[PDB]
Design a protein around this ligand. Structure first.
Ligand SMILES: [Zn+2]
Ligand SMILES: [Zn+2]
Lengths: 370, 369
């Protein structure tokens, strides 16, 4: 039944952008009279470059351009139509609602999630979404938000960053949140943003552009977050929890064997009763509660992911709009999308049932894509 | 049967321990009457507990035990004999000489490397070693040390941490060192130690023992270090440089595709001519200048490593003595060793030429054993 579904694809909707425009501290959005697109500024490392451009506009324009590729639904549909994608499960891009004040967060999350539902309603059958949660608000407010979003048309899950309520995903206070999401039968899509402390990349990292934080920081962040969840016993505590991991689990398929060896050889864990004979291994969790996207750019990585979770638990994605062509027309086909489709072909063969599964039928099944 | 070679195996030799025993600041070693092993104190926090045991013989022993598994050559030979290993290429364990002052470092490195050669001489044909360098010293002193160790019997390469001279492996000042090691035809074994800043593991990390820093920190450190090397053009600048990466490249085989995609989609690099059409990709470097150890614990990881570098560039190792059995007899076979041997068998088949290659014949060829 080969339909192509993209489960890793992002937007900033109008209500979100307008909210950021009203902000006076990071993250926030400024519209310069020189440029046709607003500027998104997240890190305080470039709020300074704003002041330069605000006074001496000869300086480089700060932050990221809030392009049509992030903000325009028509642009999203164009991307889909020109890259052979039938269905997208769209999600709010980083940094989501993580930075919002507790009192304002639930109301803003409501408006933004409402707008996502309405965007999906413009192209019935071709658009679904993962909702973001107001995780800076009290847990009761978070649980109320979950019960709300599960009743929004076209919502098929939750997108979650690695910070949780502020102390990461092994925070015990998140257990009722995971239970609420799991009982609502909402898939959790875990996505990176915070990366690693920039010092790890050394004094020359800027010479390499964004390669180190994007190529290494993001997948390593995802790995650490899920490893923490696993070690805390979250998957054992919430057995109906299902997680989709960005970028083929970051590095989890490659390090799963090492994680297992380190656990069974850890003196502290063994001697305090944390390594019982009946323990569910990370391999078991990878087959039973984890889905992996196929945003890995190589048959080498993809084969490791398939070996870890199985071909029925891998899902195609593009990470649109984060990797546009630098020299070819951005309104033409994107090689960053094509790279992963090619990885799928080389890994399991073109026209195979496994290819059809990874390219969309797994997503159709798991997310009940009407 | 073809030779089984272990290329990832560590020791703290007597001269190194004696040097650490004389130190008054981290890292240091101290012995006690109530302990049958010396104590390795590597962290600032442990100094509090040192004085407590230094005062009271009732209090808890500080640091971690310098066991026979680290310190005894007879113990190393016993491990080899009970885990089916014919040859070990031994190396000084972390923290090596990184902490030493520039003036004392070359003399200490000289003594330690000479002792490694002498240890190998006690079991001719079964022991070789990677030498450690005094990288806190001036580069001219480092180059002199390199020319010395290459002429020590049984030396077959260099072991290198990720800090380099103090600013990592993409430090321009380190280029003459890479050139010197490469021109001496010495393999560089890159090993982790510094991991990641502990804050990345969150407030509950101690509840998980050492799992997060060891399972994630070490391989991620290796990945970042080699990626920095690659982006800096070190492999292009030193075309005869050959490097063996600890723990199957950390995560490099899994992230190589992502690294490449991020490079070709980087505006800054593309617009500044750093992504020319004839650039040697990370895949090419993985096949031409990188060897990977097989210390990966699963056929899943091993298959990715083999796909990346080829079966002729994978080498078996044990990481002895870092993962002893917790309950099982430590003088019997080690699970941590057999896991990797089993991974090889499950990946390329027991008795195959690929298996014989990974289990030792690659090391025999590349290191001239
Ligand atoms: Zn993303
Ligand atoms: Zn090691």
């Amino acid at each position: 039944t080969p339909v192509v579904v993209d489960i890793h694809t992002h937007m900033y909707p109008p209500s979100y952008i307008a909210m950021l425009e009203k902000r006076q501290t990071i993250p926030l959005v400024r519209t310069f009279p020189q440029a046709d697109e607003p500027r998104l500024i997240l890190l305080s490392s470039e709020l300074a470059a704003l002041d330069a451009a605000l006074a001496d506009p000869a300086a480089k324009l700060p932050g990221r351009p809030l392009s049509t590729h992030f903000a325009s639904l028509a642009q999203k549909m164009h991307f889909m139509d020109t890259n052979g994608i039938r269905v997208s499960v769209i999600s709010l891009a980083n940094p989501w609602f993580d930075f919002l004040a507790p009192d304002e967060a639930p109301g803003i999350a409501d408006a933004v999630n409402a707008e996502f539902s309405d965007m999906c309603a413009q192209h019935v059958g071709r658009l679904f979404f993962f909702a973001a949660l107001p995780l800076s608000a009290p847990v009761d407010a978070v649980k109320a938000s979950i019960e709300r979003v599960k009743n929004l048309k076209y919502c098929r899950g939750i997108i979650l960053g690695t910070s949780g309520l502020g102390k990461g995903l092994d925070d015990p206070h998140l257990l009722p949140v995971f239970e609420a999401v799991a009982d609502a039968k909402l898939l959790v899509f875990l996505a990176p943003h915070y990366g690693l402390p920039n010092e790890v990349y050394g004094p020359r990292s800027e010479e390499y552009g964004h390669v180190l934080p994007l190529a290494l920081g993001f997948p390593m962040e995802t790995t650490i977050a899920v490893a923490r969840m696993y070690m805390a016993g979250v998957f054992d505590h919430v057995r109906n929890l299902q997680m989709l991991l960005a970028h083929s689990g970051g590095t989890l398929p490659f390090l799963a064997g090492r994680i297992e060896s380190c656990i069974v050889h850890d003196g502290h864990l063994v001697k305090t009763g944390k390594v019982p004979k009946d323990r569910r291994t990370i391999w078991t969790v990878l087959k039973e509660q984890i889905y992996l996207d196929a945003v890995i750019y190589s048959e080498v990585g993809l084969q490791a992911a398939i070996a870890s979770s199985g071909a029925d638990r891998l899902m195609f994605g593009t990470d649109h709009p984060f990797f546009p062509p630098i020299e070819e027309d951005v309104q033409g086909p994107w090689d960053s999308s094509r790279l992963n489709a090619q990885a799928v072909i080389k890994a399991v063969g073109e026209g195979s049932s496994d290819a059809a599964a990874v390219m969309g039928l797994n997503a159709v099944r798991v997310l009940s894509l009407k």
